[PDB]
Amino acid sequence: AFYELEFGPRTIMTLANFPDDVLPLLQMESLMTFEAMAYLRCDALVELGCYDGRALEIARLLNARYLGVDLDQRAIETLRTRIEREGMSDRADTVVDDILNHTRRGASVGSRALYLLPFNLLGNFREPKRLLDSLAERSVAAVVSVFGDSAEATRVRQSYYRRCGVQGLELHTRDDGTVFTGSDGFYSRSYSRACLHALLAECGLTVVRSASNLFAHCVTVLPEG
Amino acid sequence: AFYELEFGPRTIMTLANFPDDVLPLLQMESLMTFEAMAYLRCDALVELGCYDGRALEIARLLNARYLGVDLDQRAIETLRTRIEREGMSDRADTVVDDILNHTRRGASVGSRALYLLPFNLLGNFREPKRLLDSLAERSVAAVVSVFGDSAEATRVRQSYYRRCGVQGLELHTRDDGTVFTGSDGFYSRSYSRACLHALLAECGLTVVRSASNLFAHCVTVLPEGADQGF
Ligand SMILES: Nc1ncnc2c1ncn2[C@@H]1O[C@H](CSCC[C@H](N)C(=O)O)[C@@H](O)[C@H]1O
Ligand SMILES: Nc1ncnc2c1ncn2[C@@H]1O[C@H](CSCC[C@H](N)C(=O)O)[C@@H](O)[C@H]1O
């Protein structure tokens, strides 16, 4: 709903609106994704909500296939021009579509694809089970990066979302995370290590690696079967 | 000189001042450092120009030692608080000193230390051979990240330095790279694949892996005569 707005994806994904304490989250998920690709021998990387290809360099340096899924057409156009200039036109592609449409009805990318859900993508879903169930039913390994329920995490997010200029930004503290809502249909929540592992268990996704810094949690998961 | 100014490191290293085209450079530099440490069995990471510990997460995920060197007091204070809260007080450490001072007269970190020169740090040295010569003693390996001489790179750099707000920003075109100067005492040059490999060869640093995207070049080097054991 929110990311169907003209400058909805831009305002959220532009580095200009990023506090300095966001970078640790982005670095942790990058290294987790990179190593998960190598160990599980994933010849493809499917970044759900790629924007301008935030995980293209991972797929590039492993000489793996890439697919960037996002609703922002302007950001996907940057990624298309980037793929051409880098010379990955043969082993890189982009689609302008809802990530749930791709995961449900889309075609396979390579033989073994890793599905990245970067920068608290799972937090922007009210019923995230629908997305995690489509991954589980796809029989593909996945990486899930979310914000933490620490005091420092919530502070960085509050700053981060205010720079983006989310109309009617309201903080809602819960036991298993902190939820930020906006008048423009903006929804985003953080996760506790326990809640995230519990949610993934409910959707039949086994945790093999689990990294957690001050700001973020990142987990590599395998579908049961 | 420029980074001894109170808000010299702050303006250059604040994410808000980064174009979106810069993140690929940082990502490539991170993945190569992460993999170099693993392959070369480095038990310690020494990030020169760490700011707020920009490579701390690499040392964290490898269970390796960490030392952040930077002139910014406020940025090192953020790193100390982060090291404390993430429970790395026994593994991680920080110093507020000139990287050349540390590299010449500083104590070693662990048995096998990899020295990271991140985000075109080597570019901000008029006489970079001074910095490269000092690495031989205290390190078994090093990662050198640096901007490219490409048209797209110079465009991103011009955009990047303008957002940082460098006083009297001037572009000086060369065959080797592109030099950006400021009236603050700011200096920052890019390198060509050839000129970088040539400079590292002159200082006795052998290139092992060499990655290059549209904007940047990143190389893993070994000092000639250093230990290559486990
Ligand atoms: N249903 C959907 N289909 C496609 N892209 C989506 C999407 N939902 C989100 N995205 C994309 O996901 C990317 C990152 S979402 C970032 C979330 C934010 N950091 C937070 O804390 O909540 C954006 O570029 C956005 O366009
Ligand atoms: N001589 C020195 N001693 C200590 N830190 C230094 C230093 N020179 C630079 N630094 C630190 O190195 C960090 C990165 S410098 C980044 C260079 C910039 N990206 C460019 O393109 O030119 C800064 O935080 C700065 O404080």
Numbering used by the authors:
A (entry chain A): 16 to 240
B (entry chain B): 16 to 245
Give the published text.
AZE synthases catalyse the intramolecular 4-exo-tet cyclisation of S-adenosylmethionine (SAM), yielding a highly strained heterocycle. More recently, AZE synthases have been discovered in bacteria, namely AzeJ and VioH, which are involved in the biosynthesis of azetidomonamides and vioprolides, respectively. Interestingly, they show sequence similarity to the class I methyltransferases (MT1). Each subunit adopts a classic Rossmann fold, consisting of a 7-stranded β-sheet (β3↑, β2↑, β1↑, β4↑, β5↑, β10↓, β9↑) surrounded by helices α4-6, α8-9 and α11, a topology that is typical for MT1 enzymes.
